[PDB]
Amino acid sequence: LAAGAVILRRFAFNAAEQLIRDINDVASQSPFRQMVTPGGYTMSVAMTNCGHLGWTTHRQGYLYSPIDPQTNKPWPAMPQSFHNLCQRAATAAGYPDFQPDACLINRYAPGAKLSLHQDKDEPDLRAPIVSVSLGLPAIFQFGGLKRNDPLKRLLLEHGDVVVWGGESRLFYHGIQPLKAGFHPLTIDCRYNLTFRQAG
Numbered sequence: 637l638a639a640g641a642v643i644l645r646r647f648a649f650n651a652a653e654q655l656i657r658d659i660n661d662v663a664s665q666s667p668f669r670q671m672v673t674p675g676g677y678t679m680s681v682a683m684t685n686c687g688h689l690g691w692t693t694h695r696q697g698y699l700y701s702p703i704d705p706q707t708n709k710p711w712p713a714m715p716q717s718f719h720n721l722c723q724r725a726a727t728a729a730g731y732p733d734f735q736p737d738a739c740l741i742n743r744y745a746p747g748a749k750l751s752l753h754q755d756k757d758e759p760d761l762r763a764p765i766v767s768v769s770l771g772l773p774a775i776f777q778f779g780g781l782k783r784n785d786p787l788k789r790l791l792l793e794h795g796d797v798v799v800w801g802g803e804s805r806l807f808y809h810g811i812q813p814l815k816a817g818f819h820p821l822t823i824d825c826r827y828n829l830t831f832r833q834a835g
């Protein structure tokens with residue numbers, strides 16, 4: 637279905653409760669904000685980061701910054717639960733040398749979406765991206781190298797971890813409007829953690 641992608645469904649189930657406590661802690665220092673894309677449009681997905689570097693939008697485009705543009709303070713440190721879960725996930729996928737220095741935390745409110753894009757702000761594209769889904773289920777869609785390539789759908793549920801390596805690392809991807817509902821741990825939203833080798 638996807639070359640280089642290792643899907644580990646429900647892998648983060650045991651760590652989930654502590655990951656949500658740590659997202660809330662990260663958010664108390666660097667709050668969730670809906671970033672404004674270079675063209676002047678506010679994204680529906682609320683984001684924040686933890687680690688040495690953090691993904692953000694800017695006037696000139698998209699970049700990794702060691703400073704939070706909103707608080708003007710550094711991003712919070714990468715929590716131990718985050719580091720430990722990512723490490724075990726990457727190792728189980730055949731990447732024991734993967735050491736992330738950036739974790740983009742996405743919050744999806746009901747109806748929130750993320751249109752087709754590529755993750756190409758990283759120095760080494762051979763390095764994977766570890767994605768961890770928490771809360772409400774979402775339909776992830778992926779294509780190919782071009783923007784007009786056929787889209788394939790994949791449901792990502794609570795605890796699902798996918799290590800996007802190989803060819804799948806360069807694929808155009810996104811999230812369809814989050815369907816309304818309830819989850820015992822997140823109430824009415826979905827969280828997604830994307831660990832990156834940004835330095």
Ligand SMILES: O=C(O)CCC(=O)C(=O)O
Pocket residue numbers: 740742750755767769776792809810811828830
């Ligand atoms: O929410 C997801 O599962 C994907 C998020 C994503 O692709 C991104 O933020 O770069």
Ligand SMILES: [Mn+2]
Pocket residue numbers: 753754755809
């Ligand atoms: Mn992405």
